């Protein structure tokens, strides 16, 4: 009924700013909690996020930023029917959390490859720094981290055992939170 934990958001810095907060006691955020987020221009438009229940008493939201730059600033208004519960601000550019890489498969030398989680025009594509974890599925003790940053999201290695692999990336120059590791592919 009362947000105990002030809301916190990270931005994928292309389309989605995911939020979360925590009230006191069980709340179906979707039934009642109303989040209202608007950017800071002159003919600003109103967007309403339908929240969800992350835990018993906590809530989660997902703002949709069609195109966001370094000078964007959102007014986050959490409603309760007609009782304002919290009012604040959000700058998507300081709290960036990139997308997860994907399309990860495997092809002497051994070839790993994945997709850039963003198109080239997106700013994160220019200082992305991939990190690929190769751990053996047969040998959990065997694990290795591979730093990548090439514009082509791929890796080559040529070290009997069976290994797995999963990649996560993050835009270096923007001081982002380590993205979620890509799905874990498997091979020998």
């Amino acid at each position, epitope marked *: 009924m009362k947000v105990l934990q002030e809301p916190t958001c990270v931005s994928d810095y292309m389309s989605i700013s995911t939020c979360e907060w925590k009230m006191n006691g069980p709340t179906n955020c979707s039934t009642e909690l109303r989040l209202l987020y608007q950017l800071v221009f002159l*003919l600003s438009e109103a967007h309403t996020c339908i929240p969800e229940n992350n835990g018993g008493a906590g809530c989660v939201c997902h703002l949709l930023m069609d*195109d966001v730059v370094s000078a964007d*600033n959102y007014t986050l208004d959490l409603w309760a029917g007609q009782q304002l519960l919290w009012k604040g601000s959000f700058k998507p550019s300081e709290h960036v959390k990139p997308r997860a890489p994907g399309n990860l498969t495997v092809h002497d030398t051994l070839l790993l490859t994945w997709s850039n989680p963003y198109p080239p025009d997106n700013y994160l594509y220019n200082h992305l720094t991939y990190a690929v974890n190769i751990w053996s599925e047969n040998d959990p003790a065997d694990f290795r981290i591979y730093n990548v940053t090439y514009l082509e999201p791929s890796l080559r290695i040529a070290a009997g055992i069976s290994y797995r692999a999963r990649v996560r990336a993050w835009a270096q120059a923007y001081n982002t939170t380590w993205s979620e590791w890509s799905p874990s592919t498997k091979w020998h």
Partner: nanobody
Amino acid sequence: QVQLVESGGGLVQPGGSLRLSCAASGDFYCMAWFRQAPGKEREAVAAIRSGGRSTYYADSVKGRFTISRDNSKNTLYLQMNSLKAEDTAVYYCAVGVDGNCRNYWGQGTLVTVSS
């Protein structure tokens, strides 16, 4: 300091068209136009993002007026068609780097939709 000099205003027969032009010495995050009429305070007619890709118009002018800027040298445009008589006003082109494009204004140019 950035000067703003509008142009392209003048007398227009109603239902016609009118393309406004206001040059800025440099480029800006926020760029918007402001129409101000006799006894009527300057209202936000049209705005444009930093990296653009998002136009913002007033309900009175949506689908009617279009705001834009050329390449190389930057020049705020307020293209207007089907100009209604109640649009008669000195429109001002204003620029900004945060929130409302209220960093500069540089006066404006009068639009008079004739009878």
